[PDB]
């Protein structure tokens, strides 16, 4: 009921980020949403003495038909002070990624019940553009904690801890983790029981609410205990061609950068001479042993891999074709913290960019569950193509950072 | 008296840490001072400025300027210093409408709102920063001190605050009259509609009555301005638009500046004149920026200019947007990285045109450039019409399918259909996915000395064919490309090539069809002639047979 003071980081002004072009349907959706938000006191019109801006657009959440406003507060979040006053930071729960089922709830609607510091409101300014700039864009700022702003869960945390208290005490084995507008709820129950607990959980928020959230009813189900990883595997063959052995030596040479003890001497010796690529080469005993020893090395964990919470996570993605995508998450090169592969890219069989956008969201979700922050993506796409289309397929309430890769990596061959 | 509503004041601040201006008033002639006193006396009578006491420490210089071919002086208050110290504002006008996105109107009326401007008050707390001083006759009395009560012409905040103030006043009128459009530019309101003229005039009178609620009057004697309108470099008519006349000058010789102006005009023309080209003229401007230098036009530039004169020989117009119809965008390849497009709804009735130029860089291909043009047109179309056009592209559906399924990057183009208008965009070569049975295998390598730039490139094959060429003025990376070129030259129509150059593989795997490097172009020319090419990579210095053999031949 009383506001928490907020400031920007020393020597920084507010965000001044251009609104990107919006389609007619998204503008109309935003005009309706913001008209209601204004009637409810959540936002207010602003005048020309506020020069700040943050981009806004609209999405449809997964399995819903109603438009959701999404503000891209990435710039404001970078510029906003850090929040360690009451707590140094909420230790990320290592048990969340170990639960049989995790359901993600959209609790962002809760933030609108808390007023925002009057002196900070100007920095949340945003614009609803008009088609062809024919009318002045509609300018608003927030009066309440905004969805997507890193300060909202931090300021709401004391309220959240009290709302959830009876449920946690009543269910001591449930793991509950908040990230931005998301609540991640993990348990080891049979799914039917699990959903009932999730539905039990919704009622606490609803009961609290009335003392109606548009997307609280929804539920994104995950199963992190079944999440799958990608060790390095070598072919098992009866007939090795010159080409096969060259590819193997290439892959082993690459793996030698990650694992020590990798040898290719005996395998390369097989290719002595100047041979046809399609010629079949019988493996010698020495080459078979060296291969077997390499296989044994690749079954072991990478040495000296640790997570440092002070460093960025980096995610690389490769297009493998036929709807398949590989990815790696690391902080230091050759020190992967997780690797993975998708082929299940939903409703996007003829759209590369929709597939990549869904891959980006899935990887970010995995990274939030495991480490409690989002990675910086290295995307195999031209900037202009990505920036034209990704908002059409985005369904999450957060947005990670990304950069673009313009030269094809050899590494695609080694994760293939 | 009829009560009028006040205009809400916009609160204004100086930039953090900055104080107001303290600039010396210049001495003036007795004649100039007398002129400024009379002018300021009238502004004071009208409420625009007020005399202030000696306590105010701020000052901005004031000047008197002779209104040409007249005996009347004008005042100029030079707010440059205050402007440096005044906060930034939201500037609503940054993005201007494109004519191609406007809708046809039966009637467009212009209302002069210059007088309303002086009903917009300046934030009371900011007024002190606008202080200025008329020097006194002979410097024998204190100068007359004034500050502004209204938005000063020339002050940083005036355009944004005026525009926002008018918009807020007009909002209920626009909202409750959805059958008109209202656009403000400078001191005029433009009101358009499709009503029969009697009803349209009724709406204008209703707007005037609405504006009177805030005491804002407009000139009864209707404006002298009427369609067509000259606006932002365009001509607007009720049912069509074009650019203002494009006149390319005749010259016996051309300077740097002349060519910059020519390309500027051509770029501007290219939004409605189809097929404008600027590559060869822009090539003349590479790297140098001495505006007076005379650059001889190349034969190619003279040809491009002649082609442009023919395109511009007579007027072309665009039509306006009909939201009930689809948008169609058609693209053609023009050569040398140039692309041209038209956007229309009905055949042969363009809304606008445009062009796209290849981005600068080492290598490219036509499919990538076509994709880039599509993305540019898509984004422009979202801006102008709020939707993506349906595309008509000079690329076969099967060509696109082969490209995107095999390309290492994610790529997408929205709904489109093939249009068979040459030259068509095609794939010029396709590398094999697997080694070729029965094709000779060429192991290539290169090396160069970093000091002398002497080097070697060559190959060895499984048939015992070999070649090493000594080279001058080369580098390690270049020799790797030269070695691949040799292998392509000396092999049959199907060939397996083994390289240890990650660099060379990275270039060829990017699938360029044209390059800034003549060597890469020669390689591309060779690839096009082959039936099948498999390019395999191996790590150097790992004891791989053929690779180690050729490495020894070129590194000695
Ligand atoms: C942007 C704009 C510039 C001017 C003009 C500024 C100036 N000078 C006048 C108006 C009324 C508008 N606003 C809109 C909005 C939607 N459709 C149109 N169509 C439209 C406008 C003018 C003519 C004409 N003649 C025909 C159609 N105009
Ligand atoms: C002593 O030689 C070398 O270390 C050597 C390289 N580092 C090398 C790197 C890329 C491509 N080709 C290469 N070749 O051919 C080499 O010989
Ligand atoms: Mg080499
Ligand atoms: Mg070598």
XYZ file of C-alpha atoms in Angstrom, chain A residues 83 86-87 89-90 111 145 151-163 178:
21
model
C 17.820 -5.218 -5.265
C 16.210 -7.043 2.421
C 17.917 -10.160 1.025
C 19.408 -12.566 -3.212
C 17.163 -15.632 -3.058
C 1.998 -7.164 -9.453
C 4.479 -2.719 -10.537
C 11.937 -4.775 -9.792
C 8.411 -6.184 -9.685
C 9.174 -9.666 -8.240
C 11.784 -8.123 -5.931
C 9.347 -5.586 -4.494
C 6.464 -8.067 -4.427
C 8.581 -10.802 -2.792
C 7.537 -9.981 0.773
C 3.909 -10.138 -0.343
C 4.500 -13.410 -2.205
C 6.228 -15.079 0.757
C 3.175 -14.423 2.954
C 0.598 -15.467 0.348
C 9.604 -17.271 -8.752
